[PDB]
Amino acid sequence: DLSASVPTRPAEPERKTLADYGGYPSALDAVKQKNDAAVAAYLENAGDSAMAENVRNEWLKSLGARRQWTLFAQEYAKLEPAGRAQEVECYADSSRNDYTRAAELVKNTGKLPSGCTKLLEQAAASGLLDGNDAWRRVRGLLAGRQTTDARNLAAALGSPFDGGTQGSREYALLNVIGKEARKSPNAAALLSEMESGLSLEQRSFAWGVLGHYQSQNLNVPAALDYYGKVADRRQLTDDQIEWYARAALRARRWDELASVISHMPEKLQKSPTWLYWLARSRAATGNTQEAEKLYKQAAATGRNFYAVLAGEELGRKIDTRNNVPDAGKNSVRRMAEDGAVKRALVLFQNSQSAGDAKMRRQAQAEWRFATRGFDEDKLLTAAQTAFDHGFYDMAVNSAERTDRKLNYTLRYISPFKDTVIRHAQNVNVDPAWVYGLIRQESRFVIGAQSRVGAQGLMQVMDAAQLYTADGNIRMGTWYMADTKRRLQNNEVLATAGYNAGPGRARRWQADTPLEGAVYAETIPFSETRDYVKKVMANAAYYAALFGAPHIPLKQRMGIVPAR
């Protein structure tokens, strides 16, 4: 059952909501201009909104950088803890000389916000960083071309890049681990020579860089050779070790894959991906009981790609029956009366009738803010509220945030159904697949617009039709079908091709057939890799809702042909 409880935060007039949005972009500009007066002014009589919270966060990032600690302390105190930006959090801790966050932040080997980067430097100088993690971050930054951040961190650790000790040596290793040097045919040879004057840690990292590059280029034998020389796998960045795993996966080396996963950070080990592939590994080596236990863990992570695959290895097929009742109409009407939710519905209403894309995005921001910390019943109530106002993406996003209470008709909405079904049938493609793609591409926002310039529901006679929902869907489905036809009629390749181009999709094929999930998990582009898994997962959910003949997701993924 569902609770009818809804929040009752103070509601402002529509005119105030709109008046305050009127000044929102200027407030952000003032932050950028360092006009503290303007900002303070915007905030002093602002609603308790995402608008105020965003301005306050960006302001605090600015204030922290400029070392205006008095004003910082004052405004930081006005933020909701759940609403603080990571970097603002780092600035605040550094101002209190509290380096508690450093133990976890230092495990990140990539670019961090400036406040977070400086917190690690200060912690380093205070002898508060674990030496192993600290130097691993220095290498990661070096290998990721963040040379300045690597410099400063090495300096802060007491061994700068021109000091004759470790720092100078780590810097020196760029002849091997540089972004361009790693691609050299003699990178391996060069490392092999100087290996003698290298620490265990340095050697492991360097071989990881070489194997990572080969692996992400889908040169599997070479990758596994280089990775094979890594003595301490825990020295690897998260991307390096995942690509080690990906190489072992693609080569079907189950014993090595299991071994590699066992050396991952615990948080990586516990992701749906490596829960599943470790279970497959166990299953493939005869350790059934251990496999079954891991499939159970994986299935429990939610509605995602690997959770479904793991469910199928347990004989459990997807079931889209709701395990909760519909939200009651009275609840839904009352949820809309809440001040935070109303402010979101107001900005979203007015962005439609004013055609303001930016106002719509702030309405999304207000929705996230309004529903932050909602229990599952309120989430499900707010999801129907969004749906009723045509705020389709927030309907989906609210509904999918529950863990135990499942409304599949709100998680997998299907507006425009007579239009989508028709266009899909006209070019001979699965409607479930089409809905699956739309849900991922645009979250059913008819006006949706990518940075790359992709347009409409499908993020793609007269050409202008592209911008109407009928024309967009017509073109998207045609291109889905055409791309599929160009890629040996395979739906996994088509999905990758839709996102990255059919040239790339074909380039990622092996010279032997690949299991679909294996092709998908080893896609070199992280955005495309994630896209394919979500689209195909979505599709399996839509097929169930549509009452189509049951097709396991593992079967949907099928076999990707050799090229």
Residue numbers in the entry: 41 to 500, 514 to 616
Wording from the paper:
Lytic transglycosylases (LTs) degrade peptidoglycan (PG) to produce N-acetylglucosamine (GlcNAc)−1,6-anhydro-N-acetylmuramic acid (MurNAc)-peptide (G-anhM-peptide), a key cytotoxic elicitor of harmful innate immune responses. The crystal structure of the outer membrane lipoprotein LtgA, a homolog of Slt70 that belongs to family 1A of GH family 23 from the pathogenic Neisseria species, was previously determined at a resolution of 1.4 Å.. Briefly, LtgA is a highly alpha-superhelical structure consisting of 37 alpha helices. The active site of LtgA is formed by ten alpha helices (α 28, 29, 30, 31, 32, 33, 34, 35, 36, 37), with a six-alphahelix bundle (α 29, 30, 31, 32, 33, 34) constituting the core of the active site that firmly secures the glycan chain.
In the course of monitoring the LtgA reaction in the crystalline state, we captured a native version of LtgA with a distinctly disordered alpha helix 30. This represents a newly identified conformational state of LtgA whereby alpha helix 30 transitions from an ordered to a disordered state. Interestingly, this disorder of alpha helix 30 did not affect the overall structural integrity of the active site because all the other helices making up the catalytic domain remained intact. Moreover, LtgA was already shown to be active in the crystalline state in our previous studies, although the molecular details of alpha helix 30 interactions with the ligand was not addressed. In this study, we identified a variant of LtgA with a disordered active site alpha helix 30, which is important for PG binding and for the catalytic mechanism of LtgA. When LtgA, missing the alpha helix 30 motif, was expressed from an ectopic locus in N. meningitidis (at an elevated level compared to wild type), bacterial growth, cell division and daughter cell separation were disrupted, compromising the integrity of the cell wall and PG composition, and diminishing bacterial fitness or virulence in a mouse infection model. In our ΔltgAltgAΔ30 strain, we observed significant defects in growth, cell division, cell separation, cell membrane irregularities, and fibrous and membranous extra cellular material, which were noticeably absent in the wild type, ΔltgA, and the ΔltgAltgA strains. However, the PG of the ΔltgAltgAΔ30 strain was found to be markedly hyperacetylated when compared to that of the other strains, with a 102% increase in the amount of acetylated GlcNAc-anhMurNAc-tetrapeptide (GM*4), a 39% increase in acetylated GlcNAc-anhMurNAc-tetrapeptide crosslinked with GlcNAc-MurNAc-tetrapeptide (GM*4-GM4), and a 46% increase in doubly acetylated di-GlcNAc-anhMurNAc-tetrapeptide (GM*4 GM*4). LtgA enhances the activity of Ape1 and an impaired LtgA results in a dysfunctional Ape1, and appears to poison the cell wall machinery with devastating effects toward the survival of Neisseria in the host.
